């Protein structure tokens, strides 16, 4: 499976890079770092959890923005290497209004903007916070989507070298990689 993209028609004329830069600034930084995770307000959650899931999801503390990372994900918590998210990352869904969770059988978004699927990312535990999965997801938590942008760029170029993070969603749709919402 090659990378597949779903996008709201709103972003037809946007490039993926610009969309993601704007989304990152919109979601912001939840300030998830040592000494700044003191309650549940900026942890997010796993489905099913407690520290592992086919989904990890997080709401912005600033806005209604949220993301859902899909795959086979693991968090080391306090075990070495500490505070490492690793495993398989298949998908990233970006949007507004996170719903659900482990107790209701999964996370969803009420208003998804864009999703990237078949990412094929797979990072081992021993790589720690240098792992690609860790950096992609932590980027989305911390207001910097450059790691995700980098991985999407590489996957698009592998489909065809005319495709990049700087293609518009409509260009990517013409190329058979992306698809606009039914509407």
């Amino acid at each position: 499976m090659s990378i597949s993209i779903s996008y709201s028609t709103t972003y037809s004329g946007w490039t993926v890079a610009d969309y993601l830069a704007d989304w990152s600034a919109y979601f912001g930084d939840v300030n998830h770092r040592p000494g700044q995770v003191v309650d549940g307000s900026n942890t997010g959650g796993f489905n099913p959890g407690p520290f592992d899931g086919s989904q990890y999801a997080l709401k912005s503390t600033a806005s209604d923005a949220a993301f859902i990372a899909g795959g086979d994900l693991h968090y080391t918590l306090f075990s070495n290497p500490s505070h490492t998210l690793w495993g398989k990352l298949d998908s990233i869904a970006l949007g507004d209004t996170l719903t659900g969770g482990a107790s209701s059988g999964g996370y969803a978004l009420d208003s998804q903007e864009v999703s990237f699927s078949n990412l094929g990312l797979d990072s081992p535990i021993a790589q720690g916070r240098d792992g690609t999965v860790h950096k992609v997801v932590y980027g989305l938590m911390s207001g910097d989507s450059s790691a995700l942008q980098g991985q999407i760029d590489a996957l698009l170029k592998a489909v065809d070298p005319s495709l990049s993070i700087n293609s518009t969603f409509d260009q990517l749709a013409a190329a058979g990689v992306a698809h606009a919402t039914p509407a």
Side-chain angles (χ1 to χ4, degrees):
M1 293 292 293
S2 60
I3 184 165
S4 304
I5 296 173
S6 183
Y7 67 99
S8 175
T9 53
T10 309
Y11 309 96
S12 282
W14 286 64
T15 72
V16 185
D18 287 349
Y19 170 76
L20 290 168
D22 255 46
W23 189 87
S24 285
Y26 166 57
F27 184 99
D29 186 352
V30 300
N31 297 309
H32 184 113
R33 58 179 69 84
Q36 296 183 179
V37 184
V38 301
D39 64 19
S41 65
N42 61 347
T43 56
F46 291 92
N47 172 30
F51 309 113
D52 302 86
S54 61
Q55 307 172 303
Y56 171 72
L58 178 65
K59 305 176 162 166
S60 177
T61 47
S63 62
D64 298 0
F67 74 86
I68 306 172
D72 188 11
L73 293 166
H74 313 286
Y75 191 62
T76 61
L77 189 67
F78 310 127
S79 317
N80 294 328
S82 69
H83 303 293
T84 295
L85 188 77
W86 63 280
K88 294 166 59 182
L89 182 65
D90 181 85
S91 76
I92 292 289
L94 308 176
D96 285 340
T97 315
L98 185 61
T99 65
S103 62
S104 57
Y107 289 106
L109 298 169
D110 271 348
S111 304
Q112 183 181 103
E113 286 169 15
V114 177
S115 64
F116 310 88
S117 295
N118 307 315
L119 298 178
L121 297 170
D122 191 356
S123 300
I125 191 166
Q127 199 137 60
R129 301 182 206 145
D130 296 316
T132 300
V133 169
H134 187 270
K135 294 171 79 153
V136 165
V137 175
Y138 188 67
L140 296 169
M141 302 163 69
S142 63
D144 180 1
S145 61
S146 66
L148 173 60
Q149 289 177 48
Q151 297 304 311
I152 292 160
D153 194 56
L155 290 157
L156 290 174
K157 286 177 181 172
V159 178
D160 188 282
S162 75
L163 308 179
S164 71
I165 201 82
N166 308 124
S167 311
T168 64
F169 286 97
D170 264 21
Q171 286 176 250
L172 297 177
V177 164
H179 311 79
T181 54

